[PDB]
């Protein structure tokens, strides 16, 4: 279940996005929050975000939809198969160099963040990033 205190906690979070206290979260309102925390998202990104959480398709997120998403948990398999995209020839391992380059230059991550990543996975140098280990750690 969710707890009485938990539901309160989520209501707080929801209000931090819902600037106009009108019971829903717009793209503009989410963009505002994100820009407030120093990000420069495209309205494309904001729409994609809202669509992942918008159930009834009204274009805004209501509180039900919000606590549905906060309560969302197969994802192990998805993340494992993501690492496979970079697995030279189905090793099971990824070179830490390859991991770092992907993690920094492709996609979304900082050198510090990736240092944490590699430090949480490598078994000395040898056993270069066994991604099965990553996937299990995250789940």
Q: Which does 20 bind (CB under 5 to 8 A by kind): Ca ion, another protein, none?
A: Ca ion
Alpha-carbon span 114 to 121, nearest angstrom = 11
CB of 71 to Ca ion, least distance (A): 16
Comparing CA positions, the residue from 39, 42, 34 lying closest to residue 17 is: 34
Alpha-carbon span 130 to 139, nearest angstrom = 15
Contacts 24+ apart (CB under 8 A), 105-111: none
Q: Which does 13 bind (CB under 5 to 8 A by kind): Ca ion, another protein, none?
A: another protein
Q: Which does 44 bind (CB under 5 to 8 A by kind): Ca ion, another protein, none?
A: none
Q: What are phi and psi of 38, to 5 degrees?
A: 90, 25
Binding site for another protein (CB under 8 A): 12-13, 16-17, 33-34, 37-38, 48-49, 52-53, 69-70, 72, 75, 78-79, 81-83, 85-86, 102-103, 106-110, 112-113, 115-117, 134, 137-138
């Amino acid at each position: 279940q969710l707890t009485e205190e938990q539901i309160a906690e989520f209501k707080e979070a929801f209000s931090l996005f819902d600037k106009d206290g009108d019971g829903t979260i717009t793209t503009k309102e989410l963009g505002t929050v994100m820009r407030s925390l120093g990000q420069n998202p495209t309205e494309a990104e904001l729409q994609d975000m809202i669509n992942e959480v918008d159930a009834d398709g009204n274009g805004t997120i209501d509180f039900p939809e919000f606590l549905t998403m906060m309560a969302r948990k197969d994802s192990e398999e998805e993340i494992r198969e993501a690492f496979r995209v970079f697995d030279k020839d189905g090793n099971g391992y990824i070179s830490a160099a390859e991991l770092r380059h992907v993690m920094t230059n492709l996609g979304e991550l900082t050198d510090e963040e990736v240092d944490e990543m590699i430090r949480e996975a490598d078994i000395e140098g040898d056993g270069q990033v066994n991604y099965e280990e990553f996937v299990q750690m995250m789940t």
